[PDB]
Amino acid sequence: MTEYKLVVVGAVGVGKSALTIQLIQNHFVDEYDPTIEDSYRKQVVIDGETCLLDILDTAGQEEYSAMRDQYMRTGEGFLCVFAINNTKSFEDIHHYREQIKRVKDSEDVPMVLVGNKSDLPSRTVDTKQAQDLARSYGIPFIETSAKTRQGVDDAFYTLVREIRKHKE
């Protein structure tokens, strides 16, 4: 059994841990929590084989700059989630894009453009925009909702294959 190290990053108000809770025990959290660093591991059957889903959470505080670029010496799976409820988060993705690209020292890397809060009527980011950026980033776009559980597992199963594609 291999442990798939996946790191979820993004802006504040996207609800990163919300997707995790939805994927672990199948539940949508309403209350927001300022998570600094939480550990989430679960054995799931991916591609037929039992794999260990290692999900590490990150803080939304831009004050820990010396922590963001500290142990990020290694990285197998990156998760860039954005919310269509806020256009700033969509633009903030560009900052993380170059940030990670610079730290990774590479361009090609298994990634997925996932959008949360897609069921919210506060659509500030249209679908065309996401597809446009996805084409430039070179990664697929997957609309996901934690409130209605809109294909959550499908957004993970894809990334796992991408990693295996990059490796073999």
Which residue number, 48 or 71, has a Cβ lying nearer to ligand UXJ?
71
The interface with ligand UXJ within residues 70-99 (CB under 6 A) comprises: 71
Among 2, 7, 96, 151, binds ligand UXJ (CB under 6 A): 7
Which residue number, 102 or 123, has a Cβ lying nearer to ligand UXJ?
102
Residue 4: how many other CB atoms lie within 10 Å: 20
Using the structure block, give the residue that is written with the tokens 């499908």: 154
Q: Is 104 in the site for ligand UXJ (CB under 6 A)?
A: no
Distance in angstroms (rounded) separating the CA atoms of residues 150 and 143: 8
Using CB under 6 A, count the residues that bind ligand UXJ: 5
Q: Is 68 in the site for ligand UXJ (CB under 6 A)?
A: no
Which residue number, 69 or 126, has a Cβ lying nearer to ligand UXJ?
69
Q: Is 66 in the site for ligand UXJ (CB under 6 A)?
A: no
Q: Is 54 in the site for ligand UXJ (CB under 6 A)?
A: yes
Helix (H, G, I), strand (E, B) or coil at 162: helix
Q: Is the dihedral of CA 48, 111, 92, 99 positive or negative?
A: positive
Q: At what angle do helices 87-104 and 127-137 cross, to 10 degrees?
A: 10
Q: Which residues pair with 121 in a beta bridge?
A: none
Q: Is 5 in the site for ligand UXJ (CB under 6 A)?
A: yes
Closest distance to ligand UXJ from the beta carbon of 150 (Å): 26
Strand bridging mode 3-9 / 39-46: unpaired
Q: Is 56 in the site for ligand UXJ (CB under 6 A)?
A: yes
Closest distance to ligand UXJ from the beta carbon of 38 (Å): 11
Closest distance to ligand UXJ from the beta carbon of 143 (Å): 26
Distance in angstroms (rounded) separating the CA atoms of residues 96 and 100: 6
Q: Is the dihedral of CA 71, 73, 79, 83 positive or negative?
A: positive
Residues near ligand UXJ, by CB under 6 A: 5, 7, 54, 56, 71
